[PDB]
Amino acid sequence: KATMIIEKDFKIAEIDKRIYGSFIEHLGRAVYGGIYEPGHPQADENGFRQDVIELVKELQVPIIRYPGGNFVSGYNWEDGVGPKEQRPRRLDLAWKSVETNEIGLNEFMDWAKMVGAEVNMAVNLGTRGIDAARNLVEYCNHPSGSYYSDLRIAHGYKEPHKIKTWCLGNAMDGPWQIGHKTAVEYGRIACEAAKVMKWVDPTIELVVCGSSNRNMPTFAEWEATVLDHTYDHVDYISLHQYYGNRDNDTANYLALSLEMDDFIRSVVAIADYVKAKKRSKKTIHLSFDEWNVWYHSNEADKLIEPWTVAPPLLEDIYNFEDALLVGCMLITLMKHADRVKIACLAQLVNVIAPIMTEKNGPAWKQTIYYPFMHASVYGRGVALHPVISSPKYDSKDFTDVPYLESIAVYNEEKEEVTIFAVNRDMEDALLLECDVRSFEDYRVIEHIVLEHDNVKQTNSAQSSPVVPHRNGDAQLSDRKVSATLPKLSWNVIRLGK
Amino acid sequence: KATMIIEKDFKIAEIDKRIYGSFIEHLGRAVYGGIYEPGHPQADENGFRQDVIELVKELQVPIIRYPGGNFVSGYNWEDGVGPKEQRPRRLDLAWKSVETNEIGLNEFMDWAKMVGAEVNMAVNLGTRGIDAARNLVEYCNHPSGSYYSDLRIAHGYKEPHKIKTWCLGNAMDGPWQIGHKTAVEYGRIACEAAKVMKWVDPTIELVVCGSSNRNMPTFAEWEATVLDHTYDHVDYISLHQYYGNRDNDTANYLALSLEMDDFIRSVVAIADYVKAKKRSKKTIHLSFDEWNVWYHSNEADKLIEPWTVAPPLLEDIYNFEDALLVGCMLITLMKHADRVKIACLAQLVNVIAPIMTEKNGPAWKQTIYYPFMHASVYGRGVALHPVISSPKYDSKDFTDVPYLESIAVYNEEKEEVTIFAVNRDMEDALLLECDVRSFEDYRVIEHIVLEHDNVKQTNSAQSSPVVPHRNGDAQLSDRKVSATLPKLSWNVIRLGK
Amino acid sequence: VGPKEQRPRRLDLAWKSVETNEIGLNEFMDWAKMVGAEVNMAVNLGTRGIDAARNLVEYCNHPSGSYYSDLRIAHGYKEPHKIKTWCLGNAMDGPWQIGHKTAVEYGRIACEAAKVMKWVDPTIELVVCGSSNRNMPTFAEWEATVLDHTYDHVDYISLHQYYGNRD
Numbered sequence A, B: 001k002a003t004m005i006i007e008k009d010f011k012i013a014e015i016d017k018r019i020y021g022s023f024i025e026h027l028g029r030a031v032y033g034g035i036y037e038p039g040h041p042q043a044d045e046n047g048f049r050q051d052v053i054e055l056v057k058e059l060q061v062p063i064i065r066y067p068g069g070n071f072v073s074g075y076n077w078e079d080g081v082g083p084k085e086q087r088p089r090r091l092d093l094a095w096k097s098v099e100t101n102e103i104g105l106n107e108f109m110d111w112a113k114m115v116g117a118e119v120n121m122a123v124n125l126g127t128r129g130i131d132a133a134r135n136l137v138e139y140c141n142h143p144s145g146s147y148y149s150d151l152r153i154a155h156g157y158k159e160p161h162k163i164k165t166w167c168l169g170n171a172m173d174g175p176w177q178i179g180h181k182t183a184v185e186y187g188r189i190a191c192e193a194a195k196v197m198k199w200v201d202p203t204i205e206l207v208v209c210g211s212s213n214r215n216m217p218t219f220a221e222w223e224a225t226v227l228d229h230t231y232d233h234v235d236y237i238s239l240h241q242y243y244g245n246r247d248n249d250t251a252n253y254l255a256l257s258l259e260m261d262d263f264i265r266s267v268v269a270i271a272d273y274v275k276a277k278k279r280s281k282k283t284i285h286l287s288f289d290e291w292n293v294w295y296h297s298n299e300a301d302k303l304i305e306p307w308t309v310a311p312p313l314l315e316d317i318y319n320f321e322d323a324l325l326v327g328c329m330l331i332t333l334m335k336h337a338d339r340v341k342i343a344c345l346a347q348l349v350n351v352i353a354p355i356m357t358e359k360n361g362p363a364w365k366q367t368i369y370y371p372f373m374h375a376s377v378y379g380r381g382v383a384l385h386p387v388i389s390s391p392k393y394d395s396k397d398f399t400d401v402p403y404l405e406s407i408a409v410y411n412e413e414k415e416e417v418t419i420f421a422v423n424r425d426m427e428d429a430l431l432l433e434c435d436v437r438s439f440e441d442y443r444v445i446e447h448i449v450l451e452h453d454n455v456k457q458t459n460s461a462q463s464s465p466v467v468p469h470r471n472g473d474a475q476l477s478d479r480k481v482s483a484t485l486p487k488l489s490w491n492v493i494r495l496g497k
Numbered sequence C: 001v002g003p004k005e006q007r008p009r010r011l012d013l014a015w016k017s018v019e020t021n022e023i024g025l026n027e028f029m030d031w032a033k034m035v036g037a038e039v040n041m042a043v044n045l046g047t048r049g050i051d052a053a054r055n056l057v058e059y060c061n062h063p064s065g066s067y068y069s070d071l072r073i074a075h076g077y078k079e080p081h082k083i084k085t086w087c088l089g090n091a092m093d094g095p096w097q098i099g100h101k102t103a104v105e106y107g108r109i110a111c112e113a114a115k116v117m118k119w120v121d122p123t124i125e126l127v128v129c130g131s132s133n134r135n136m137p138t139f140a141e142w143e144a145t146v147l148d149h150t151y152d153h154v155d156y157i158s159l160h161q162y163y164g165n166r167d
């Protein structure tokens, strides 16, 4: 048994829809063979796969980070604009590929328009600096009457792209990064880049890079230093996290979102420390701008020869327990709606992705597609503070792991309450009782369930055994929703009226 | 109208009773003419004033910090132990007084025993260091069979004092402090002191010094650095805050608890930053080990000539509005019961104190005595999360100040729920409605109110116009408490059965 | 040192034992004489510093006619011990050490200690503390910093190593 109070008046915050964002890098087949494949039967007049367009629309992704990631730290934006014949072929040192630049930022903006997403554009602070930063904001956002704005117009884009949210480089705390910088070096260049960007266009907002990973030797120290240098000029600090089940321990693997919770809380604390140090009235929020499961493709990638065009890198094939963890991660983002305002599932197409494609072939939905779609589609509104009493377990790395991972989201305009819930229990069903007295006249609309008896079962182009059904048994009786959550399941219990 | 949900299952934390602590320094008349006055008709066999003993006992103060405060940073503990004829007269540079050491630590422990309080003992890290720190812990806490333990026995104290909680110096960040240290210097000496003290007696807890106030140029930076140096060896970090109404603005004055709230949240954040930086599983809590109103006596103090014995320093005479602010401060400590585990009203007797005395004459209760008493006596149990909908106002330094400052404390053992509540509204009553559906069979025991028409009214030895009455109108019907909180009122609504 | 009745019992924080001081340095010198060994004497640079270092060298090595030398004589040891080789503390890089010092803090105090000890008796040699072991996070960095601080005033740098067959 587990219980949960769903009190209308105990609220965390309005969920910023941008926590359902994603990310496309010039990495493997994310662009070339992902969003863009001339000649494909479903390619439109600009070469974009219509099938991929539809799959992304169904996810209702509001914002997509672009073009990197490790790639941006060695990239020249000018290489990807203007007539194709003058675009150079480059050695991308991030992924050891030859980048033709056949797609650059203006074509990416064209694609983003088709899926209804704004773009969170990243500037190179690896090999480049403040002058390229201002020039790109000018190129994208300044109407006309300057060299760079008129250049965009000359390239065929009369109206400025009017990009709101920019990343100040990619995480360069990492020794694997092109133009790695210490926290002071990065802090200083990000501060000066931030200023010139906002002088070109004061309507923008800026994301400073947090650590590439919670396990970095410089974790926390990095964020504190970087914010000390940039606080007044920036709006968000980013965090990144990937998980994997490398020792085949499901119970420990599904507990990993408790760590994500600790990580978010830690970075919020650093933001508030620096706020107090500066005596600033401005609160800095979080952009969780890379998160996912990533591990299945590690061995296969080691066999790819360098200097090919669009190699099949990072092509994890996700299984059902992966979807459960993705589920737990989304609930964790919602739980921190008060301070996490942007998040990006890394990445959107082919590369550790909910959507996979075959060349001259179909596009299909990975297991992780479903909880993400459900969260994005039904998780708009106010995140409510959960009061839960759940049974618990210990695993290798965690203690008092609740079997139940859950939160309710209240959408007053729709008069709906959505309960997202994972039952981590590998053996037993969990009898959830939700107290819903504060929601008068609400009825159960539906109870969606994603479950599969084999946690290692994947989907594929040829069949999808791992798909949601609507046979959940949630029911209202005397101001209480009782629902059975099957063992190892993701549940969406929708209420309304 | 304001509303409030009082749900048993929406809890902040068990309140640590040590948030109702206080503090006695060798400062002015706190000791000499305060707790201790051999000539007094009401002095006991050891010179302790019995009237003061009774006044402290009624506060139920569980812990008292001693002997400083600025005094400790120049103090040699050995000067205050052993036969009185061998105790030296010293120039106390902190308060420019001659300290006779007629009272030292053993006599203080005797006094604390009488009032039922444990002692939070401070070690000198101004002119002294790690050797004096271990020796003092040995003298106080080691049973026997070493030079210092046998010395305590020889001084007349067979059983060890077994002092639990120790301060690593006094706030050393101040340029006015004896033996001021930078955050690095202090962090290092506090770390090395903490280690040897814990090796003498591993049962102890240690408090590291935070900033002397939120306005210090080194605020926040101090706490981060100090904790980076000491995290693994200490248990709490301290904060200090004093307030004053120097510009006669009551509305702004009563809002100041909002700032206290932010100050606490800032120091919690720093603790959690450093925790993450160290990858530690230990959480550090806060000791709010100096807090009060302090300003009334600033001008009188300037005229005191140096090198007297027991000068009348820091003798604020408190008024009614000071009591309201103290009440708001107390509610703010309770609302941070999850992370503030010790707090000390600075100070207990004569010195910015709830109890005042006259030589050979009476002891009396300042205005601030009452809210402190009510919080201490009725505020043991679990602090509940307030969901308050209250009207609000703007003042000079604050926006959206709730007229209602309030929290409930639920004591399961006594089966009581107590609602502490200040109405800051300077002109109008506030009709409070509380949803206590979660508390079956409860009734209103009483509704205590502290109010006076004149915010500047003081108490005195001869008359006390400012005293609580029990004619509040709180009533519980159909699972709802409705009470009228008069304008500018401190309220204690007690429920039971 | 001195009459046994005036020697205090101390809590030795290093090994959590009560040290009676029934044996101190003069009795140790007596024992070392019996086994034919010279003594490599260590000074405390944890809770103590440069004043205690010069005074100990004076007590042990200065012949007579100063407070500390005449004190050794009065304690029953007319001829000076004439200790040749001294340790400037024990390895202070360890977080388990009483009065742990960073490499800079230790380098500075060892330098100033070495100077006064040599001014009392220029015939001595000094050993500066290296790392407590090769696996310390500060290994090598420690030795470079310490020697940068002390090079001109010292003669040796120490190393420590223990081994075990735990697997």
Ligand SMILES: OC[C@@H]1O[C@@H](O[C@@H]2[C@@H](O)[C@H](O)OC[C@H]2O)[C@H](O)[C@H]1O
Binding pocket: A025, A068, A069, A070, A071, A170, A171, A176, A212, A213, A240, A290, A346, A347
């Ligand atoms: O989303 C794909 C990439 O993830 C980030 O890369 C890091 C990876 O290369 C490193 O080896 O481990 C930690 C990862 O964070 C990078 O931002 C992006 O290009």
Ligand SMILES: OC[C@@H]1O[C@@H](O[C@@H]2[C@@H](O)[C@H](O)OC[C@H]2O)[C@H](O)[C@H]1O
Binding pocket: B025, B068, B069, B070, B071, B170, B171, B176, B212, B213, B240, B290, B346, B347
């Ligand atoms: O409780 C009395 C004293 O308050 C603290 O002293 C500081 C004061 O002297 C300074 O001038 O203003 C701020 C105060 O924090 C001190 O800890 C104690 O002795």
